Design a protein around this ligand. Structure first.
Ligand SMILES: *[C@@H]1O[C@H](CO)[C@@H](O[C@@H]2O[C@H](CO)[C@@H](O[C@@H]3O[C@H](CO)[C@@H](O)[C@H](O)[C@@H]3O)[C@H](O)[C@H]2NC(C)=O)[C@H](O)[C@H]1NC(C)=O
Ligand SMILES: *[C@@H]1O[C@H](CO)[C@@H](O)[C@H](O)[C@H]1NC(C)=O
Ligand SMILES: *[C@@H]1O[C@H](CO)[C@@H](O)[C@H](O)[C@H]1NC(C)=O
Ligand SMILES: *[C@@H]1O[C@H](CO)[C@@H](O)[C@H](O)[C@H]1NC(C)=O
Ligand SMILES: *[C@@H]1O[C@H](CO)[C@@H](O)[C@H](O)[C@H]1NC(C)=O
Ligand SMILES: *[C@@H]1O[C@H](CO)[C@@H](O)[C@H](O)[C@H]1NC(C)=O
Ligand SMILES: *[C@@H]1O[C@H](CO)[C@@H](O)[C@H](O)[C@H]1NC(C)=O
Ligand SMILES: *[C@@H]1O[C@H](CO)[C@@H](O)[C@H](O)[C@H]1NC(C)=O
Ligand SMILES: *[C@@H]1O[C@H](CO)[C@@H](O)[C@H](O)[C@H]1NC(C)=O
Ligand SMILES: *[C@@H]1O[C@H](CO)[C@@H](O)[C@H](O)[C@H]1NC(C)=O
Lengths: 446, 547, 80, 89, 253
């Protein structure tokens, strides 16, 4: 039977023989008969060696088929296993890593005993959250999976097959879940990404893994966050500025809880207070620890009440990034442009605490602010006074995000935008402008 | 030709030697070439069941078709066992066939030490003698594909799909200048990069021509169905940039040929498919004139209630076998002909007798189909149009999506490499082939010396040439009806809202729909599924159950 | 003529208004509807069986419980 | 350019409702004439951007708001009907 | 399928939906991912964040009254304080309070026997006969800590009582540990000797007819006429006529 595989590590080659004077079919009929006249052939290969020069046809008899990877059954959508050097060609139909029908009568005892390939780095079971069978669902449609058959050559030492598959997921950052099942012929190790399926309700917050066809033992990398914790307040490396100095808070959705590491009031442009009024973003360069543990004042709006309170000002260009603990590794970001009124009066809570859509959806929320009124959107003539102030400040925030969100743990190719009521008229303009694909700001739009 | 006519499995040899003599008896075969279980006479006044090789059993000759006779397994399992009782010498083998009558794939004796895989006809597959339990058995393709590679003639692999069963359309290549079979297990191997497109293939073999033909589940060619598809004017596709697949099957050179084969078979046979097991048995019964002609209800499956000529009558499942609780002389019976109330009555009564208080009884058309396909403007391009001039059969559109897109691995790739929906017919058939076969610019894509004999097909129509009605088999061809469907089918693919129908057809789970034709089975059925009533409602059925 | 009546089939005990049939855990084996414990010369190690498997030569601990893998040991450990 | 779109209005989105905070400072100093002049200036904008009478008299029939005489019951509601189906929805 | 904690521990590890202590206004140091046993008890002295506190089984809240007090001691202060109410004052023993296995209410209604968790074994008594439920006094076979899913009632006469929600696989004989030099006889109380029950899984009938042998009188047809050529010829002819087969309608098909 042909294996559905194209690369093998831990190979144990029993015999090799070149053949080029025969045809393909007649040369293949020699190649089956040679493994037949070998009492502990497990299977044979049949492939061109040195295909980069167009090399000749071999019939290499194998003793063991150690680990079998890069299956041709997930397509090529998600590879974490290198599928061979381009010098063998196990691709064309008469060629193939073939094996015998695996009889329960094994190879007789005079054959040289085979070993698994040795693990490079020593793995520990303490660095892998073991999970139960009652916490997954079979989903025969998921497509970011991988598979690696480890054959029944290692009859004993199930824990050495396990330490070999976990030593492969520990080398790749894309793999986060390792499920492996024994079966008649191999130990089928599979590999996944962070494939969760939570069922949010009011009486609880249950979560469980998405899996293709189930396995016995399930192993998972633990959660990790890119946020430091001194005195249990969060901080984060900004690229060229330094560290922020944020705030932590536990929130309630139904009956369960989640820590959201709220960095409120993060600046992204210079304050247009006086004579920087009616000019520009003018990007600011601070350095050190920015005190980011409180909301900032919002912008002056048409219809502003006369209460000159520290909740409204002109310098509102400040972001409120709301991050759950242990997000998805390449996370998702929602940019939400919303200045607010003075109906709240310096209470210390944000007018839209966007950390709940962050928590329930396992994503990052950057609640934004932008100049509305006459302090922005003031055009005159055909000169330097342009009249897109606040509208070019939305670019000043979206470029802050897709530069500095790699520190917070996000992914600036899944980042969205959304505006509230009438700002959605003036924040839909960015979807119109055709720009370079390498510098596209968002990727969704609500 | 003769590679299946010399191993004609001599039931079919004994038909033609008896049919030409003008005799009152002729033996009746199955589609494979084996004898049927029940043999009859031409007048239908004496039917008797037969052994393996044409010899009848020693007394079952009922004046009429028997109620039940013995399968080829249980013929052999009695014949071995009484030979171990008359001669009293034991033989350490007896078959272990299932309820269907044919052999189980795994076969061994009572001690169960060497269990091997066997062919469905009966002969032992040479090589797979394991020591106790085969994990999988080879099917009819992979046996024929490997014995080919050992070298018993015909150097071109009878390609197959995913379990070793033959695909119904088989395309082999041939040089016209010698009329010998083109070597394909070597030319796909020795020249891989020559098989990118047909323009890159015809420049490497300027004498070869494609030869596609229908075939049964045994791999042998059906009689008078072979086409010789020319491949000169086939242009390139957008699928050239992808890598070459493993075998010849998944190559884009193969799937264009089966689409060009079955699109011709639509205007010839009225089916966008090869004929199934029902339609082959109906043609070979009408040809030799013997009784028990089957009935096929336009879907390829067997029509349920089947009567023979002026005799007893019964009903049949979708496999060709008799339902044992029915043999009614006179009127035809009523076997499950939309009688699903009495089964559905039992689900309401078991929901009626389930505790109290609605703790679970709430949670006791499929889901996510009624509110995505039949409501959201996606089915409305299909069963709708401008006027009455379609007669578009919906066991042709669910055959149209099935044969054009055979699996979900194509619907993702055809949608990912498509920007303009008007370009979709170009990179799917290799041209604008539906209006070339609708408005008949196909003289140049086909050719002579393919076993269909176009000339004796056009004389009963008198419309045109290349150089009621009966099609490739006993079929009715309203050719005006068939040409109007393919004009609609080309306009179906030139829509932005078919690509958005095809995107949601990928997201259908596997258990509710196996193939994309089964997606078209459920969606065309879910348009009538009104939402389920209140859970405590129970319908009322008749005596037999008729809602 | 005994009519139709419920039972359990593969390797399970049958206890006698509901869910009465029991998994037959390890240390035992289903012979004929009554899961007899596995004899002293063998061991079972997994629930719901027909028979129990041998351990290497001259190995048990006490009796026909035959609990798990570390219960066929030599008489070196039966020295008392 | 590939970006998915999830779009949608409310039923409450009126330009009277978007000017709820605008009325509050007008009520503070006190200008009752800044409401009846606001609706007609909104009715002035109800047609085209050039305030064509051929569209403004056409659309003021269709929402049937030609009763700016005695009450602001039907005249204030049906104006919000008209602006929302041209500025919002 | 998971318990009240293994479902919550999964939510704590996978997507950080932690629980909280005291529910009033929890700081993020007051949250915890639940740590639990092989069964879903909440595993006394579970800890995360600020430090280590103690949480009673079957309820994720902490046992608010050093070492955290035992289950009898918090339930005695839960019944006498009248916040929880099974229906009796619990009876601790004088040191390391588990459950002293003579448990009954005011005015001696009905006294019954406990497990380690405190639940009924079952098998209860009325105050005319005080239920003697003591130690086994014989060691368990194969070095077992305790028999899972039950205790050992002893009247100087010991047997296995499977818990409420299970059945003993073999019938528990009235075994004897009446100071018999610390051993059993003729049967051992094996570990794992009770499993949770499960629904009926096969259905079967019988049938009766006879052949009425035509060739005279012949019960000499015995050699290869009992298991060979019969039980098989009557079986092929039974399934050729179609009686080893149920074919019913799943909505048409
Ligand atoms: C595996 O290796 C064998 C041996 O190298 C490959 O077979 C060789 O394939 C090349 C083409 O790639 C053939 O060359 C051709 O020769 C003919 C003349 O015979 C010439 O007209 C062509 O232009 C071309 O140069 C070569 O003959 C052939 N050799 C044999 C012995 O078959 C084979 O293709 C390799 N397999 C794969 C899948 O690449
Ligand atoms: C098998 O596993 C055990 C336990 O992990 C280990 O001590 C032993 O070395 C392994 N055997 C081999 C040959 O690696
Ligand atoms: C996140 O995306 C980047 C894109 O280059 C990739 O390199 C990285 O491995 C991804 N991380 C995870 C954990 O998927
Ligand atoms: C901040 O640094 C950048 C570095 O390129 C510089 O161009 C910019 O002028 C600086 N901002 C100010 C206000 O000087
Ligand atoms: C049937 O007859 C043929 C010869 O015509 C013979 O080869 C074959 O073995 C026979 N089969 C049986 C089952 O008698
Ligand atoms: C064995 O029994 C068969 C039964 O048909 C009989 O024909 C045959 O003559 C017997 N003897 C031999 C030598 O085969
Ligand atoms: C087909 O037949 C002609 C006959 O001369 C020959 O030249 C040609 O090479 C043949 N095709 C192949 C594949 O060899
Ligand atoms: C059929 O007609 C079309 C349109 O004129 C033309 O492009 C095409 O080449 C014709 N087909 C053939 C085979 O000449
Ligand atoms: C405004 O629209 C709603 C839509 O439901 C309608 O019911 C209402 O009558 C409209 N208002 C007026 C004043 O006509
Ligand atoms: C049982 O095993 C434990 C270790 O698991 C050991 O400490 C003890 O001595 C053994 N024997 C008895 C009688 O408990």
């Amino acid at each position: 039977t042909r294996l559905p595989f194209q690369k093998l590590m831990g190979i144990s080659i029993r015999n090799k023989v070149p053949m080029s004077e025969k045809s393909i079919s007649n040369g293949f009929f020699e190649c089956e008969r040679r493994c037949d006249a070998d009492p502990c052939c497990t299977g044979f290969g049949f492939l061109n060696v040195s295909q980069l020069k167009g090399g000749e046809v071999t019939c290499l008899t194998l003793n063991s088929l150690g680990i079998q990877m890069c299956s041709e059954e997930n397509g090529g959508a998600w590879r974490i296993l290198d599928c061979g050097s381009p010098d063998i060609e196990v691709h064309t139909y008469p060629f193939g890593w073939y094996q015998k029908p695996i009889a329960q009568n094994n190879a007789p005892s005079f054959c040289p005993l085979v070993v698994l390939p040795s693990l490079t780095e020593k793995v520990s079971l303490d660095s892998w959250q073991s999970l139960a069978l009652s916490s997954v669902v079979v989903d025969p449609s998921i497509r970011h999976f991988d598979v690696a058959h480890v054959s029944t050559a290692a009859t004993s030492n199930f824990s050495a097959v396990r330490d070999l598959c976990l030593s492969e997921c520990s080398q790749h950052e894309a793999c986060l879940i390792t499920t492996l099942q024994t079966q008649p012929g191999a130990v089928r190790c599979m590999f996944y990404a962070d494939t969760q399926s939570c069922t949010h309700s009011l009486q609880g917050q249950n979560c469980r893994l998405l899996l293709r066809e189930e396995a016995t033992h399930i192993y998972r990398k633990p959660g990790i966050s890119l946020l430091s914790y001194e005195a249990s307040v969060p901080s984060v490396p900004i690229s060229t500025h330094g560290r922020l100095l944020g705030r932590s808070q536990a929130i309630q959705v139904g009956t369960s809880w989640k820590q959201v590491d709220q960095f409120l009031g993060v600046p992204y442009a210079a304050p247009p207070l006086a004579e920087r009024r009616f000019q520009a973003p003018e990007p600011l360069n601070w350095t050190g620890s920015w005190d980011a543990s409180k909301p900032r004042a919002s912008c002056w709006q048409p219809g502003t009440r006369t209460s000159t309170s520290p909740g409204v000002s002109e310098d509102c260009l400040y972001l409120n990034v709301f991050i759950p603990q242990n997000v998805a590794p390449n996370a998702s970001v929602l940019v939400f442009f919303h200045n607010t009124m003075d109906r709240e009066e310096s209470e210390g809570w944000p007018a839209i605490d966007g950390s709940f859509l962050a928590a329930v959806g396992n994503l990052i929320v950057v609640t934004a602010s932008y100049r509305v009124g006459v302090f922005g959107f003031l055009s005159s003539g055909s000169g330097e006074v342009s009249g897109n102030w606040g509208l070019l400040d939305q670019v000043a925030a979206l470029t802050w995000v897709q530069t500095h969100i790699r520190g917070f743990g996000g992914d600036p190719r899944r980042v969205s935008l959304a505006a509230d009521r009438g700002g959605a008229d003036v924040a839909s303009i960015h979807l119109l402008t055709a720009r370079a694909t390498n510098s596209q700001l968002f990727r969704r739009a609500v | 030709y003769q590679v299946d006519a010399q191993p004609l499995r001599p039931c079919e040899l004994q038909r033609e030697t008896a049919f030409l003599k003008q005799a009152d008896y002729v033996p009746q075969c199955a589609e494979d070439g084996s004898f049927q279980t029940v043999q009859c006479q031409n007048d239908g006044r004496s039917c008797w069941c037969v052994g393996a090789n044409g010899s009848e059993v020693l007394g079952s000759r009922q004046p009429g078709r028997p109620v039940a006779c013995l399968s080829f397994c249980q013929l052999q399992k009695q014949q071995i066992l009484l030979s171990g009782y008359i001669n009293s010498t034991d033989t350490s083998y007896l078959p272990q066939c299932q309820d269907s009558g044919d052999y189980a794939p795994v076969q061994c004796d009572v001690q169960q030490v060497q269990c091997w895989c066997v062919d469905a006809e009966g002969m032992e597959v040479y090589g797979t003698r394991q020591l106790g339990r085969p994990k999988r058995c080879p099917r009819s393709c992979e046996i024929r594909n490997r014995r080919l590679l050992h070298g018993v003639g015909d150097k071109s692999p009878p390609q197959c799909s995913a379990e070793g069963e033959f695909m119904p359309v088989q395309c082999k290549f041939v040089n016209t200048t010698d009329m010998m079979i083109f070597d394909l297990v070597h030319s796909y191997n020795r020249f891989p990069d020559a098989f990118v497109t047909f323009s890159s293939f015809q420049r490497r073999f300027p004498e070869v021509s494609g030869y596609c033909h229908c075939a049964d589940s045994q791999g042998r060619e059906l009689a008078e169905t072979g086409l010789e598809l020319l491949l000169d004017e086939i242009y390139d596709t957008i699928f050239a940039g992808l890598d070459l697949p493993s075998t010849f099957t998944e190559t884009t050179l193969y799937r264009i040929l089966q689409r060009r084969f079955l699109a011709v078979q639509s205007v010839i046979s009225g089916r966008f498919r090869c004929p199934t097991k029902c339609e082959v048995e109906r043609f070979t019964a009408t040809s030799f004139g013997h009784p028990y002609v089957p009935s096929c209800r336009r879907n390829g499956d067997y029509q349920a209630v089947q009567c023979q000529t002026e005799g007893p009558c019964w009903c049949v499942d979708a496999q060709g076998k008799e339902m044992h609780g029915t043999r009614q002389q006179g009127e035809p019976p009523s076997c499950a002909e939309g009688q699903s109330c009495a089964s559905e009555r039992q689900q309401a009564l078991s929901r009626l007798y389930f505790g109290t208080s609605g703790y679970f009884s709430q949670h006791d058309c499929p889901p996510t189909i009624k509110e995505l396909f039949v409501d959201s403007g996606l089915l409305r391009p299909m069963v709708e149009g401008q006027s009455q001039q379609f007669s578009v059969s919906e066991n042709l559109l669910k055959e149209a999506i099935r044969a054009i897109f055979p699996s979900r691995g194509l619907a993702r790739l055809a949608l990912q490499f498509t920007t303009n929906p008007k370009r979709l017919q170009q990179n799917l058939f290799g041209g604008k082939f539906l209006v070339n076969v609708g408005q008949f610019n196909l003289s140049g894509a086909l050719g002579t010396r393919g076993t269909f004999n176009f000339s004796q097909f056009f004389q009963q129509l008198g419309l045109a040439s290349f150089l009621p009605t009966v099609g490739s088999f006993g079929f009715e061809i309203n050719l005006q009806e068939n040409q109007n469907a393919l004009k609609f089918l080309a306009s179906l693919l030139e829509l932005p809202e078919f690509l958005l129908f095809l995107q949601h057809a990928i997201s259908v789970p596997e258990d509710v729909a196996r193939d994309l034709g089964d997606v078209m089975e459920t969606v065309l059925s879910s348009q009538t599924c009104e939402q389920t009533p209140e859970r405590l409602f129970v319908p009322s059925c008749t005596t037999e159950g008729s809602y | 003529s005994p009519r139709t009546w419920f039972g359990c089939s593969e390797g399970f005990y049958q206890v006698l208004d509901g869910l009465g049939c029991v998994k037959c855990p390890e240390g035992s084996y289903s012979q004929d509807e009554e899961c007899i414990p596995c004899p002293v010369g063998f061991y079972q190690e997994q629930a719901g069986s027909l028979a129990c498997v041998p351990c290497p030569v001259g190995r048990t601990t006490i009796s026909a419980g035959a609990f798990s893998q570390t219960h066929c040991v030599t008489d070196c450990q039966r020295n008392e | 350019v590939e970006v998915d779109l999830l779009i949608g209005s409310s039923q409450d989105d009126g330009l009277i409702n978007r000017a709820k905070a605008v009325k509050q400072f007008e009520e503070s100093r006190g200008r009752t004439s800044s409401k009846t002049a606001f609706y007609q200036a909104l009715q002035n904008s109800l047609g085209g951007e050039d305030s064509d009478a051929r569209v403004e008299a056409a659309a003021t029939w269709y929402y049937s708001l030609e009763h700016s005489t005695d009450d602001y019951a039907s005249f204030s509601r049906a104006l919000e009907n008209a602006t929302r189906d041209y500025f919002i929805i | 399928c998971p318990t009240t904690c293994e479902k919550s521990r999964t939510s704590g590890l996978l997507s950080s939906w932690k629980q909280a202590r005291s529910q009033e206004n929890p700081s993020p140091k007051d949250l915890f991912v639940p740590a639990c046993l092989e069964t879903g008890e909440y595993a006394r002295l579970q800890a995360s964040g600020a430090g280590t506190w103690c949480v009673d089984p079957a309820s994720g809240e902490e046992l608010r009254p050093a070492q955290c007090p035992s289950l009898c001691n918090v339930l005695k202060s839960g019944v006498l304080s009248r916040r929880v109410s099974p229906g009796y004052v619990p009876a601790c023993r004088a040191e390391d309070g588990g459950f002293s296995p003579v448990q009954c209410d005011q005015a001696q209604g009905s006294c019954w026997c406990v497990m380690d968790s405190g639940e009924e074994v079952p098998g209860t008594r009325v105050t005319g006969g005080q239920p003697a439920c003591e130690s086994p006094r014989c060691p368990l076979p194969f070095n077992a800590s305790e028999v899972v899913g039950g205790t050992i009632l002893c009247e100087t006469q010991c047997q296995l009582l499977c818990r409420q929600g299970s059945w003993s696989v073999f019938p528990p004989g009235p075994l004897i540990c009446s100071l018999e030099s610390g051993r059993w006889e003729s049967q051992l109380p094996q570990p794992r000797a009770c499993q949770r029950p499960q629904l009926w899984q096969t259905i079967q009938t019988q049938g009766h007819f006879q052949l009425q042998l035509p060739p005279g009188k012949m019960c000499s047809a015995d050699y290869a006429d009992l298991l060979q050529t019969f039980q098989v010829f009557i079986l092929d002819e039974l399934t050729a006529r179609g009686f080893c087969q149920i074919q019913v309608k799943t909505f048409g098909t």
